Amino acid sequence: RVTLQEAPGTVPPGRLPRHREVILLADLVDVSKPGEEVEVTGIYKNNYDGNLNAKNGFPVFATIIEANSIKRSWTEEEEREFRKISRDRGIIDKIISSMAPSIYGHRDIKTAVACSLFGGVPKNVNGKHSIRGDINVLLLGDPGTAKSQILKYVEKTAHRAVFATGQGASAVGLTASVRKDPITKEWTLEGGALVLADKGVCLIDEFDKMNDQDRTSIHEAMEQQSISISKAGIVTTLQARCSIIAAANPNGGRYNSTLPLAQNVSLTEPILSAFDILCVVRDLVDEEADERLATFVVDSHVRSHPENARQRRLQRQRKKEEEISPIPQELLMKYIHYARTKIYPKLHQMDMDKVSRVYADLRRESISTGSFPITVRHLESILRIAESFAKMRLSEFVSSYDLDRAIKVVVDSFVDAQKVSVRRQLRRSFAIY
Amino acid sequence: MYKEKMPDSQANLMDRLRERERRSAALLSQRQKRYQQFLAMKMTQVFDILFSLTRGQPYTETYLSSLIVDSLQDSNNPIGTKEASEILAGLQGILPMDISVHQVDGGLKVYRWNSLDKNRFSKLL
Amino acid sequence: ETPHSISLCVYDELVDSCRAGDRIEVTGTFRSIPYKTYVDVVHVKKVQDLAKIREVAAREDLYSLLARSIAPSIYELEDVKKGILLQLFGGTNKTGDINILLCGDPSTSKSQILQYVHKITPRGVYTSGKGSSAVGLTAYITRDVDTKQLVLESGALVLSDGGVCCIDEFDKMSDSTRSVLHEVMEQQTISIAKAGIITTLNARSSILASANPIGSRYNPNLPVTENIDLPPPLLSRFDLVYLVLDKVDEKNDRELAKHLTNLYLELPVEFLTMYISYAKEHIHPIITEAAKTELVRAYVGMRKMGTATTRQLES
Amino acid sequence: FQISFFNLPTVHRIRDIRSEKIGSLLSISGTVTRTSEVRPELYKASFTCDMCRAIVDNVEQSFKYTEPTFCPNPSCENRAFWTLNVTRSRFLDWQKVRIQENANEIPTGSMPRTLDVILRGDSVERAKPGDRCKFTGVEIVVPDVTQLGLPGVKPSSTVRDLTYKISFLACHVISIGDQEVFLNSLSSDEINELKEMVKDEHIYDKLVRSIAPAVFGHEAVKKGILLQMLGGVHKSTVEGIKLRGDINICVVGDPSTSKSQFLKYVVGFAPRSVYTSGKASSAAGLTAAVVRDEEGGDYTIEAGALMLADNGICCIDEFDKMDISDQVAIHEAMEQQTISIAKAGIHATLNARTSILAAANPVGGRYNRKLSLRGNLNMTAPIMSRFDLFFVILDDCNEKIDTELASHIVDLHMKPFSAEQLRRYIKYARTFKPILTKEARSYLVEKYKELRKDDAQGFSRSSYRITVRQLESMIRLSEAIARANCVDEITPSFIAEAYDLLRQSTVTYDKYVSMMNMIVRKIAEVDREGAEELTAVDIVDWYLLQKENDLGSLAEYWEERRLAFKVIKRLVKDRILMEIHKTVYVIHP
Amino acid sequence: SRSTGVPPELHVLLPQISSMMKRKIVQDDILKLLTIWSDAYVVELNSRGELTMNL
Numbered sequence A: 001r002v003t004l005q006e007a008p009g010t011v012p013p014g015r016l017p018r019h020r021e022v023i024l025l026a027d028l029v030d031v032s033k034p035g036e037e038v039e040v041t042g043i044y045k046n047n048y049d050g051n052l053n054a055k056n057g058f059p060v061f062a063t064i065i066e067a068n069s070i071k072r073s074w075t076e077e078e079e080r081e082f083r084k085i086s087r088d089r090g091i092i093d094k095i096i097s098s099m100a101p102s103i104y105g106h107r108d109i110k111t112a113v114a115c116s117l118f119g120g121v122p123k124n125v126n127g128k129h130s131i132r133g134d135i136n137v138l139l140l141g142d143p144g145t146a147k148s149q150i151l152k153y154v155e156k157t158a159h160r161a162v163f164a165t166g167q168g169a170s171a172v173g174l175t176a177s178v179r180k181d182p183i184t185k186e187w188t189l190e191g192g193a194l195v196l197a198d199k200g201v202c203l204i205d206e207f208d209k210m211n212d213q214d215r216t217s218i219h220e221a222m223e224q225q226s227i228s229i230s231k232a233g234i235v236t237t238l239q240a241r242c243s244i245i246a247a248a249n250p251n252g253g254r255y256n257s258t259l260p261l262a263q264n265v266s267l268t269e270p271i272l273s274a275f276d277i278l279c280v281v282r283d284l285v286d287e288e289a290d291e292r293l294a295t296f297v298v299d300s301h302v303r304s305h306p307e308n309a310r311q312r313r314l315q316r317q318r319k320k321e322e323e324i325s326p327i328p329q330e331l332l333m334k335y336i337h338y339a340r341t342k343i344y345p346k347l348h349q350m351d352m353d354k355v356s357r358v359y360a361d362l363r364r365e366s367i368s369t370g371s372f373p374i375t376v377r378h379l380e381s382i383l384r385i386a387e388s389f390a391k392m393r394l395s396e397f398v399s400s401y402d403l404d405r406a407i408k409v410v411v412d413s414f415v416d417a418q419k420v421s422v423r424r425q426l427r428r429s430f431a432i433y
Numbered sequence B: 001m002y003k004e005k006m007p008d009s010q011a012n013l014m015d016r017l018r019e020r021e022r023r024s025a026a027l028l029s030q031r032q033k034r035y036q037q038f039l040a041m042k043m044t045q046v047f048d049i050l051f052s053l054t055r056g057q058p059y060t061e062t063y064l065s066s067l068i069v070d071s072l073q074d075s076n077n078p079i080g081t082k083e084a085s086e087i088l089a090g091l092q093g094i095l096p097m098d099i100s101v102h103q104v105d106g107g108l109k110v111y112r113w114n115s116l117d118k119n120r121f122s123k124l125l
Numbered sequence C: 001e002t003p004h005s006i007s008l009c010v011y012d013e014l015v016d017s018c019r020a021g022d023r024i025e026v027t028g029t030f031r032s033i034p035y036k037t038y039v040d041v042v043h044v045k046k047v048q049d050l051a052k053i054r055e056v057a058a059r060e061d062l063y064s065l066l067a068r069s070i071a072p073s074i075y076e077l078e079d080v081k082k083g084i085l086l087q088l089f090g091g092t093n094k095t096g097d098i099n100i101l102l103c104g105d106p107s108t109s110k111s112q113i114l115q116y117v118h119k120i121t122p123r124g125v126y127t128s129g130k131g132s133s134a135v136g137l138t139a140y141i142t143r144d145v146d147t148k149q150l151v152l153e154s155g156a157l158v159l160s161d162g163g164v165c166c167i168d169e170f171d172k173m174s175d176s177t178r179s180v181l182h183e184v185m186e187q188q189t190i191s192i193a194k195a196g197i198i199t200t201l202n203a204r205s206s207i208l209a210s211a212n213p214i215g216s217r218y219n220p221n222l223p224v225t226e227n228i229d230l231p232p233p234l235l236s237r238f239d240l241v242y243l244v245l246d247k248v249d250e251k252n253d254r255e256l257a258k259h260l261t262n263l264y265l266e267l268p269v270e271f272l273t274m275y276i277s278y279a280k281e282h283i284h285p286i287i288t289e290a291a292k293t294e295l296v297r298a299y300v301g302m303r304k305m306g307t308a309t310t311r312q313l314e315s
Numbered sequence D: 001f002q003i004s005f006f007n008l009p010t011v012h013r014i015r016d017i018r019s020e021k022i023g024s025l026l027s028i029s030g031t032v033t034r035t036s037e038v039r040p041e042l043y044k045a046s047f048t049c050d051m052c053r054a055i056v057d058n059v060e061q062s063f064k065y066t067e068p069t070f071c072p073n074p075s076c077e078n079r080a081f082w083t084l085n086v087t088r089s090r091f092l093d094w095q096k097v098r099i100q101e102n103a104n105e106i107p108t109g110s111m112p113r114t115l116d117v118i119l120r121g122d123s124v125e126r127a128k129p130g131d132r133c134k135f136t137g138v139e140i141v142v143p144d145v146t147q148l149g150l151p152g153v154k155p156s157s158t159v160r161d162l163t164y165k166i167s168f169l170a171c172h173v174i175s176i177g178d179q180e181v182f183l184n185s186l187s188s189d190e191i192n193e194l195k196e197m198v199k200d201e202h203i204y205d206k207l208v209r210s211i212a213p214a215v216f217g218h219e220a221v222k223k224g225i226l227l228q229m230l231g232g233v234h235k236s237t238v239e240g241i242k243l244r245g246d247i248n249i250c251v252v253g254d255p256s257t258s259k260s261q262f263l264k265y266v267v268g269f270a271p272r273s274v275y276t277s278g279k280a281s282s283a284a285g286l287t288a289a290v291v292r293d294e295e296g297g298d299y300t301i302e303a304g305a306l307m308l309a310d311n312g313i314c315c316i317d318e319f320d321k322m323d324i325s326d327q328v329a330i331h332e333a334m335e336q337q338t339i340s341i342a343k344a345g346i347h348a349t350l351n352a353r354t355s356i357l358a359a360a361n362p363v364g365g366r367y368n369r370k371l372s373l374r375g376n377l378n379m380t381a382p383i384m385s386r387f388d389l390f391f392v393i394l395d396d397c398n399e400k401i402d403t404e405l406a407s408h409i410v411d412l413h414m415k416p417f418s419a420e421q422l423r424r425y426i427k428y429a430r431t432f433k434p435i436l437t438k439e440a441r442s443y444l445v446e447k448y449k450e451l452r453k454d455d456a457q458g459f460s461r462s463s464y465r466i467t468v469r470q471l472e473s474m475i476r477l478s479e480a481i482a483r484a485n486c487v488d489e490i491t492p493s494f495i496a497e498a499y500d501l502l503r504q505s506t507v508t509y510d511k512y513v514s515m516m517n518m519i520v521r522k523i524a525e526v527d528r529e530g531a532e533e534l535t536a537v538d539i540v541d542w543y544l545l546q547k548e549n550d551l552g553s554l555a556e557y558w559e560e561r562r563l564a565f566k567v568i569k570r571l572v573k574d575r576i577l578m579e580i581h582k583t584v585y586v587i588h589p
Numbered sequence E: 001s002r003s004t005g006v007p008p009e010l011h012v013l014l015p016q017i018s019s020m021m022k023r024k025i026v027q028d029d030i031l032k033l034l035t036i037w038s039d040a041y042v043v044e045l046n047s048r049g050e051l052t053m054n055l
């Protein structure tokens, strides 16, 4: 017996996710596991007659689906469009400039959002451990700067997005819960938010405000990509392969520019290491940036102001999408999905020198200046984002151009998180990168 | 956004304020006249409140007034408690045949409306 | 009735007459069915010595006699007598409560007066600092497990609605317990917002409080506000704060000694309560035009010496 | 096949649910507190005989599990034995809703009642927790066993017990909270009352004074409250981004400056408002509660303070007393207007379109004027930025102020628009959605630069009070200010008004300065344009011309004319306008 | 599955057809079938602005 729940990204506001009970018969058992997205064909009927009738006045029943067959998709006419754009000039710049069209600047975040949407390539060596392909982003900044609005844009554009908040969530509400079942009389387990976002993205707004017990579960979720629980006599493990985008605030509500990131937030260092991209946004006043930002915002509000007719409205909306973004949004949604599903770009050993030499050069400067030691996980992060950049072009092999941009993003984040005295020294040492 | 530099009427502006003074009371009177008509016409949609689901004479004016304000509270044009009193009392004046008012403890009681041809009386004003 | 309580049955047009927290006078029939004693309520109420009063009304030593009569076991303290008497008279609620704090060295008549007040006022409550909690003065509102209605299990500030609540060790009140006084003292309401419950109560009452000085004894070297452990927002609400100081002058010590020593060898309270109960029932004074100006000038002069918040003007 | 009535002229409160009305049609109003998941309910069943193969159809149940009493065929003698059919029978949707009495229904300080409503058919899922729904239907009695054990003689039938409790069966569900739609629902006379309240020159000034008319002074807050209750325009971005349109306000001041009076005014005036205070509030009670639901083995969301305050104003007193652990829960509703819940399997997002009006006191209980605005307050940047208006008010020993203050506070003990007239205005004004004019964008970026300049710290570039949220606030406040009048085009003037209110954080002072800004710009205009020179008398005559309509009578003319020269002399007294020798006035350096 | 003879709109039919064809079918494809046999289907337009076809 299995329950089917609405699609995470399609629930209308103000309603809990509708769900139904489904009846599975022999030879159709173990077809799916919790967190899977499946399509099932069956018969829709009422079957709770009997003991419920005399149990109470005005008795009620429930609707179930008798699973006859369950299943877990593109056309060439659509690929005629995807292949064309894939080889266009500046494909990576069109993608990044189309992330959050009505948000000014913050291009180091927009490139981080873009890479997290496409993701990398997971690997599982037999008889050894696996490697995750999901890209982890941490957004730390002063009040303002639209860190939360970014997570609201990721929610709508991504395929399967699960949104959470640090204080509004609980340890049970993330990992798993327990339900009774009279049919078999053993305890049954129902998954939380992390289980839903399997092969998807998990958004944790205000990541700092949750307690360490709630935060400990998130850490082991990104590391193991699975949920381990021993409650009510149930010991089992579920798949939790999800990408995380987190927004937070510094201590005191303002970022201390003269102290490292590891001393601006209560988030402990082992949890910080689980992120691939660490964006540190400052809000420092300057008439150069303020006139540009304000004139963008004052146009954003005058744009989004409310006020074959359907086709006319879609055409007008398309016109406004073009006016602020290079790529229409619904096409990009399809474009990202095809890249995620079809493209699995592979490495060339010709680029081994380009990767290893930069790493050794970056390691040499770590002991030279700065307190943050460069770790192998940084190199693991470089390959992942390198694969994601290749996945943007729909090319099956990693090119040298993708690696250069992949090196730029990781090095820039590592440099920008250092204190001011160390920050200026490292910017000159990595002017080439 | 500005106004006239030097109007030709310079000393006559004293007559201008005198003319405003001459009809200051008339404007306030029309404010009074209009506001009662706001209650004088609203009572048409009020005798349907009592006629529909009210069933005895022991209903007092305090209980009725709280009912009237709650029925029109959700509408686009809500009405206050003290306004409902002039509404409920307005009904008896135009309907002296089916509702009578008598006092106990200083409060008012409403006699059982025998609602009949309710709509015809409002047109005689 | 008392903290006991018994169940009542109500029928017909007597519904919509009682809500939780109300005070009722009941005339009904006592029943018993198997043991279950209850009242078939038959009615519900929710709301010669006149010349003798006049003979005292027009006398000349009226104020001194009333002030002296309240505490025959306590010497002098004329100003303390008047204000606490004025606490029992109260203001005049209109379409009123007066609160007093006693600050003084821990040997001067503080406890005895408060004991008298709650034993001379109807349904007064005696409270202390550590003897109460945040839900001690505040009624514990909860929701019924079978009828799902909102019910209240009474409280110190709810029991004494319209009466006087005596609080000893008012300084040693916990900060959480002290915090909820602000709404009670100024708005006479207790709003509670918890899981599933959102409602506000009424706790209209008068507060009589006694506070020991900071440390051991009053120190004139520190300012007055540093000898009181109350923040200004709370300290502004009290209508009267009495600084009771213990001197060493025999010209008043010996007279006090005689008053104490004359009491352990071998108007009355009935007149006093009859007097008080009459005044609260029939007397509704109205401030005159001439008396208006005095209130204005007194506050302006008091403000001009610059803690003269407007809470003292209504006092 | 179902029938649904609606549009009953009278709405009966929860306290009007009495047994004398069982079986009649009535309409009630009550805030929804819980909702249960829908289930199919047996409407018309069918059975097949056991002794023989006869079949019985059209077996109406009527609120109880009714089996057929006889086999219709005389060839069979079966009785009280039947087999329930699951195919020829018909089922219908059914849902239970727990509703609660509104705040405005019951007297202040009294407890609100509760009642359970039943929904069938298409009416299901139309009730959302926190909605101020209105139901239409009939009153029924259902079997009940909780009445046992109560005192009093219990009726019996013969033996069987027949206790009952009252429930409401609703056949229709509506949720109640654009100018042409709104205008079509009102008669001519409602228009005329509403039209005349708009078509007046000083309408903005009058509505500021009408807020809490018994409270003296604080014109800064009386402007703030009016704007918060009007609210702004909610916008959604094409890329899928939602723009908040509600205004948040905070007030801090002396323990004797009336601020709890304002909160008591709003909760007694706002159509949907909730009062709470400091330590008495909790995280679960404010936003929403996760609680075991009836009729099943699952959970449900029970509406918190904010959810009841949707499309309204939530008032909090003693905000600085609120614990940090529960101040956090307000954050998401203040900016995103949404509540995120992930606990016990209730993963959902709820509308939280609420405007917060908080009140608090300085850290030491008194404004220590020796320190700056930073030392006086314990609030931090994350929460301070979210308030479009942030007032700190002071009281000091001014002699004339106290005489006026004492005069008013005593008249209360001795004894321009009525409160009803405001609710007939705000409902109409809230339908307007202003649009920024092109030059207003140019002027807005000018002022945002100016505010960002002032808020800039002396050494570090980081600001503390003015952020990007405040730039939206300027539009959001300007929307509400324009929304108070009959224009959908934001003028530069309304940007200045929001600029003043956000930056602020004998002759009357206001009249003096108002005269100054009028005359000073007049001289600078003619000087920069090189017009002919004018004398002091001509300046006085010019100013009186500008305020022709504010003069109630020609008697007031002489007083204002006499008042004007005092303003001029004050400017010359401190050399604000230099005399050149009849004299000509030129701006001083 | 419809209690009435009103045909469903094309914007529902085409997605259902496209999955069966293992290939996306668009509006212009229907006009090809109509050209070959005029009386193949009824082509009355719905008042909602959506094309319909029926037996």
Ligand SMILES: Nc1ncnc2c1ncn2[C@@H]1O[C@H](COP(=O)(O)OP(=O)(O)O)[C@@H](O)[C@H]1O
Pocket: A102, A103, A104, A105, A106, A142, A143, A144, A145, A146, A147, A148, A149, A293, A297, D242, D243, D244, D335, D468, D469, D472
């Ligand atoms: N860099 C930016 N560019 C344009 N608008 C911004 C920017 N930062 C913030 N905003 C405005 O501020 C709002 C976002 O505020 P918020 O989500 O509360 O930020 P955070 O949650 O990171 O403090 C949006 O409505 C947006 O219009």
Ligand SMILES: Nc1ncnc2c1ncn2[C@@H]1O[C@H](COP(=O)(O)OP(=O)(O)O)[C@@H](O)[C@H]1O
Pocket: C073, C074, C075, C076, C077, C105, C106, C107, C108, C109, C110, C111, C112, C256, C260
């Ligand atoms: N002015 C006074 N009149 C009468 N008795 C007094 C006076 N001052 C002190 N006393 C006596 O001193 C004792 C002090 O006790 P009490 O006032 O009850 O508590 P505390 O010792 O805390 O002040 C009392 O028993 C009282 O008899």
Ligand SMILES: Nc1ncnc2c1ncn2[C@@H]1O[C@H](COP(=O)(O)OP(=O)(O)O)[C@@H](O)[C@H]1O
Pocket: C182, C186, C233, C310, C311, D214, D215, D216, D217, D254, D255, D256, D257, D258, D259, D260, D261, D408, D409
């Ligand atoms: N401008 C005013 N007009 C009238 N009354 C005032 C004014 N300012 C203060 N008051 C009086 O002072 C009291 C202020 O109490 P308040 O400051 O609300 O206490 P808290 O600081 O605990 O909320 C009110 O009861 C009010 O009657």
Ligand SMILES: [Zn+2]
Pocket: D049, D050, D051, D052, D053, D054, D071, D073, D076, D077, D078
């Ligand atoms: Zn038979």
